[PDB]
Design a protein around this ligand. Sequence first.
Ligand SMILES: [Mg+2]
Ligand SMILES: [Mg+2]
Ligand SMILES: [Mg+2]
Ligand SMILES: [Mg+2]
Ligand SMILES: [Mg+2]
Ligand SMILES: [Mg+2]
Ligand SMILES: [Mg+2]
Ligand SMILES: [Mg+2]
Ligand SMILES: [Mg+2]
Ligand SMILES: [Mg+2]
Ligand SMILES: [Mg+2]
Ligand SMILES: [Mg+2]
Ligand SMILES: [Mg+2]
Ligand SMILES: [Mg+2]
Ligand SMILES: [Mg+2]
Ligand SMILES: [Mg+2]
Ligand SMILES: [Mg+2]
Ligand SMILES: [Mg+2]
Ligand SMILES: [Mg+2]
Ligand SMILES: [Mg+2]
Ligand SMILES: [Mg+2]
Ligand SMILES: [Mg+2]
Ligand SMILES: [Mg+2]
Ligand SMILES: [Mg+2]
Ligand SMILES: [Mg+2]
Ligand SMILES: [Mg+2]
Ligand SMILES: [Zn+2]
Lengths: 91, 152, 184, 155
Amino acid sequence: MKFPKSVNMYCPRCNTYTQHSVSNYHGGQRRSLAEGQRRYERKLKGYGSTPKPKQKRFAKVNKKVTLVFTCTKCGYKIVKSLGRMKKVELV
Amino acid sequence: VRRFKRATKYRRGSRTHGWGRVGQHRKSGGSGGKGMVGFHKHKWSLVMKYGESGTGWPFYGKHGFKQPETISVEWRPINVGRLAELVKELRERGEVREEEGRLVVDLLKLGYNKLLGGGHMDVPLVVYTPVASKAAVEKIAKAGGEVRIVSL
Amino acid sequence: PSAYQYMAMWYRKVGREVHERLMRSVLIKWRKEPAIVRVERPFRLERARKLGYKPKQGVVVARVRLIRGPFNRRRPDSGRRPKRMGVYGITAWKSWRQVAEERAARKFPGLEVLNSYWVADDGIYRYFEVILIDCNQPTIQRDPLYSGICGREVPRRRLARRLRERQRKLIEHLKKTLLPKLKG
Amino acid sequence: MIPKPVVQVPRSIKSGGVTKWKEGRGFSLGELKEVGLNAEQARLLGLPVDTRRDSVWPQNVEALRKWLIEVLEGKATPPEPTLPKVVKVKRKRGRAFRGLTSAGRRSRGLISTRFRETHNYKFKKKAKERRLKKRHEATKGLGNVLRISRIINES
RNA sequence: GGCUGACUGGGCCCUUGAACGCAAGGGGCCCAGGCGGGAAACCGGGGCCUAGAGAACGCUCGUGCCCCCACCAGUGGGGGCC
RNA sequence: UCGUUGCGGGUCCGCUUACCCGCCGCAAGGCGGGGACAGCGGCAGGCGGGCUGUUCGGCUGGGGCGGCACA
RNA sequence: CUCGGCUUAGUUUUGCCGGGGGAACGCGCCGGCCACUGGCCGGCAAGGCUAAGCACGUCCCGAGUCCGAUAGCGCACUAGUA
RNA sequence: GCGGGGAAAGGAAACAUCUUAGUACCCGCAGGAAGGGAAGCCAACAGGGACCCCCUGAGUAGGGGCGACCGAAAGGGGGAUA
Ligand SMILES: [Mg+2]
Ligand SMILES: [Mg+2]
Ligand SMILES: [Mg+2]
Ligand SMILES: [Mg+2]
Ligand SMILES: [Mg+2]
Ligand SMILES: [Mg+2]
Ligand SMILES: [Mg+2]
Ligand SMILES: [Mg+2]
Ligand SMILES: [Mg+2]
Ligand SMILES: [Mg+2]
Ligand SMILES: [Mg+2]
Ligand SMILES: [Mg+2]
Ligand SMILES: [Mg+2]
Ligand SMILES: [Mg+2]
Ligand SMILES: [Mg+2]
Ligand SMILES: [Mg+2]
Ligand SMILES: [Mg+2]
Ligand SMILES: [Mg+2]
Ligand SMILES: [Mg+2]
Ligand SMILES: [Mg+2]
Ligand SMILES: [Mg+2]
Ligand SMILES: [Mg+2]
Ligand SMILES: [Mg+2]
Ligand SMILES: [Mg+2]
Ligand SMILES: [Mg+2]
Ligand SMILES: [Mg+2]
Ligand SMILES: [Zn+2]
């Protein structure tokens, strides 16, 4: 499905409607200093089987479409989901 | 004290001892596992009854952090109404020094370290406390007393 | 600064390169001697004296050579859960220094190990020197440090009598020189 | 009646300002100095002496002055001196084999941390509790039984 | 033809789950903020209605003049609530 | 790959004394070959049913195959 | 300090072992729950000993809402015997 | 009693991290007790003052397929005191 690159949206910070630029959400890089990553690396040390579960069978065909709407006036970002469907084409 | 006959006395001659003939008295399979187990599969209905829906929170999961207790004050507050009772008893035994024409009490020697505002103050009182709430200071001051904040 | 302070310089940064030249020759001989050898004098004299060595009759200094690295962990030959199957990297809770002291003690039965210290390393071996004392020797028995290992007995009648006398004499002295000041 | 030193209980942050007194290990050198004694003389009089303590409490000084006067006037009998009365050192056998040399003490953790926090101490402490079923080892899984029961009974 | 309500913060109810305990999901009625269409009434919190739906732990992003990190202050870093 | 690993000369050459291999000797030590390689220890990647622990779901006109009447 | 490993409540933070690297010196060094800086506070590792107060039961003494010869220790007896 | 080596069954309603458990057992070494013991301590600007053992702190902090489950220390009261 096609989606605009710019929309007029309510900005909670500006308390008004402003133009918003649209972009795809991209997950950030897992940082090694994250507490769960520190615990995992500890658990990975030493002997033993593989310590944690690792999913093998997957069932979803598509992911939820997540878009970042950036306010052009103040930079406030709203990340919203459009539901589970194939990747949108930002037009 | 009242004493009651043990159930084993009644159960002699009953074959099953209260466990029924069909689902008899078996091992840990009759409890659905050993210990506090099963709460996410077959005892999940017990979590849904007592816990938060959706997350089963108190049974499972994390919430918040704990402020370290070794660097946190353990408060022992006293209400204004309860304090008024206390000074009445203290005065009768003579433990109160009316230092300045008013009864003087200091909470720390009484074992408290905060003053709260529930109840009524019926006498003028000088209170030496590290911490006092807003209503405690007002109620004490409306009775002709005063709160004095000491430094820990 | 004692000469012992200067002797320690060969195990410090200033003297390491000269010492490391010397050991490259010395270790050739030590690799061909018996694994445990009694030596006339300690190799690190300043270190040995700090650890209780003195050249008395009945003090034995033994040099011990042993193979370094981790201990000989065995691969289990029956059923184990995977955590208990590893070999590489698993070491003993004993240091090689304690192992050296124990091996020395086997060669000198009846002697007590006082202390030990590291002397040298090579690619395969580690060298220690172990101080042992003979607790049956009259010279050893009366030594103030070695008596802690060899045993010491002082009758209670000796210390208590001496203490009671000292207390009695002190009270008489304090009557003159202190009682007026206390009451004044 | 030989006095006992009175010292202040350390005031923790958790206490919030509430303080109390306790019996100390011994009289401080400052307190002994005010009554004209050193550590040796005070110990010869049977007094407990604590040369580590820095505080000087007037109530301790006052108790010392009162009792010293009784002793120096023949009204009170000092107890036996607070110094060693026996010397009992046993011959040691197999120090190296029982981990009592410096190398053994290091591996046992006794150089870096306290005896109570060493791993062999933890192993022995918990083994005793389980053998006698003392305190928390009378019930295995006690914490989880309490946790689940609190949720059900406090819902 | 003009638009973005496929909106921000919340509450209540119906169904999933009959009378009768019990997830997630879905639907309905509203209050506040700020909009769109319309003369106005009114309607819009996706698709005329009944399907297209995912716990804990972990990670990631958004948000806040936001809270915490062990004697005190600072810098980097970490953690927390939504 | 880190250490063992040293010495001369302009990454290369050489050397032997480390170390390794064999012969002689009771031992001391000698002879020959190799040689800072190899071997050995730690760390890392690959191959690895040689060996260790386990999982191999449910419904079902018995089970199995199928199907999903499993959401 | 770093890497591997066992362990520990010790968690970016327990102890240790092994491989590699590796100080300073009292005008110094160490600790104060991630690292560093400043302040303040507390101390002086890497040497040795130490009574009392605490574990146990072959053995000795005492006791008993304990058992009473298929019980009570396997053994009340030419039982650790045949 | 001290040092070292060191499981599995079972539990987690499967099972591998984990637990069981530094247990069973093995190897070495002591005493009538052993081990510990005299601050490179703990605390928080107020002060404690070697150690071991008992009561408590406390199933608290904390560790943990944050699951099962595991689990302190300081402080306080005592025995005893060098
Ligand atoms: Mg039943
Ligand atoms: Mg049935
Ligand atoms: Mg039956
Ligand atoms: Mg579940
Ligand atoms: Mg979290
Ligand atoms: Mg198993
Ligand atoms: Mg427990
Ligand atoms: Mg349902
Ligand atoms: Mg119903
Ligand atoms: Mg649905
Ligand atoms: Mg602190
Ligand atoms: Mg090579
Ligand atoms: Mg290799
Ligand atoms: Mg197989
Ligand atoms: Mg399966
Ligand atoms: Mg079937
Ligand atoms: Mg089938
Ligand atoms: Mg020193
Ligand atoms: Mg019989
Ligand atoms: Mg009969
Ligand atoms: Mg069992
Ligand atoms: Mg199982
Ligand atoms: Mg099984
Ligand atoms: Mg003893
Ligand atoms: Mg001893
Ligand atoms: Mg444990
Ligand atoms: Zn904005």
